[PDB]
Design a binder for this molecule. Structure first.
Ligand SMILES: *C(=O)N1C[C@H](NOS(=O)(=O)O)CC[C@H]1C(N)=O
Ligand SMILES: [Zn+2]
Ligand SMILES: [Zn+2]
Length: 264
């Protein structure tokens, strides 16, 4: 599978990272799995988990007020609710299903402490056993770190294990686990990434990320028709093309098609 992935890199003029944890009956899959890639919006999934972890469910009903000023990035939802504000739960919802920039920042602020909550967020990843990932900026900055910069990066290996713990493990109590899972299930932004590479009778829930330098990611939990779960982390960028390099969704879809062929 190493050969096919390399071929995808040259076919799409990109760097590709894949990680699929091993299961009782499937070997792990690994390609540049320990190389660093920018999070982009993929961090919003563990972010919601952080918020859920730190509070009882009733916190979800806490209304957050904000102004026009508090919108500095792509925020499809937060733009619509400026006059009323949004509850923590709505911000969680906006962050996973619409990748809303302000929603993510308001949740970072909810976590508390330095860096507008980025330190607390990294701390939470550390508490999960993730020694690799780091978040240093908020939106939109965190998507604009150049190649080579370590700020706001994870690895496929690291983020896959994190997602596994959160969705399939017991990092959260079942109630909180179901909310995170449910939100991810109702996301549609990933229809052309991992979802496109798996057969349509599989279940796929995911969180995407996109950025400069041809950056496109997708992190997913997938279930076979028989109810057999897997975790799939696919990350890419095209630094060779500079800031404006186009991201390629189809690279991720093809990568996923290879993964699916092995697991099916
Ligand atoms: C997250 O990566 N971002 C927020 C928004 N949604 O893109 S996503 O659906 O791929 O997550 C726009 C792109 C990106 C950003 N803030 O640049
Ligand atoms: Zn924990
Ligand atoms: Zn490791």
């Amino acid at each position: 599978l190493a050969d096919r992935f390399a071929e995808l890199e040259r076919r799409y003029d990109a760097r590709l990272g894949v990680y699929v944890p091993a299961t009782g009956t499937t070997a792990a899959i690994e390609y540049r799995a320990d190389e660093r890639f920018a999070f982009c919006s993929t961090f919003k999934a563990p972010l919601v988990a952080a918020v859920l972890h730190q509070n009882p469910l009733t916190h979800l009903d806490k209304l957050i007020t904000y102004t026009s000023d508090d919108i500095r990035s792509r925020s499809p939802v937060a733009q619509q609710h400026v006059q009323t504000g949004m509850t923590i739960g709505q911000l969680c919802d906006a962050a996973i299903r619409y990748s809303d920039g302000t929603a993510a920042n308001l949740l970072l602020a909810d976590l508390g402490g330095p860096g507008g909550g980025t330190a607390a967020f990294t701390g939470y990843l550390r508490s999960l056993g993730d020694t690799v990932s780091r978040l240093d900026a908020e939106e939109p900055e965190l998507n604009r770190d150049p190649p080579g910069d370590e700020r706001d990066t994870t690895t496929p290996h690291a983020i896959a294990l994190v997602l596994q713990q959160l969705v399939l493990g017991n990092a959260l109590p079942p109630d909180k686990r179901a909310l995170l899972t449910d939100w991810m299930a109702r996301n549609t932004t990933g229809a052309k990434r991992i979802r496109a590479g798996f057969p349509a009778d599989w279940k796929v829930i995911d969180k995407t990320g996109t950025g400069d330098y041809g950056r496109a990611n997708d992190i997913a939990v997938v279930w076979s028709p028989t109810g057999v779960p897997y975790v799939v982390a696919v990350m890419s960028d095209r630094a060779g093309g500079g800031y404006d390099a186009e991201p390629r969704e189809a690279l991720l879809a093809e990568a996923a098609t290879c993964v699916a062929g092995v697991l099916a």
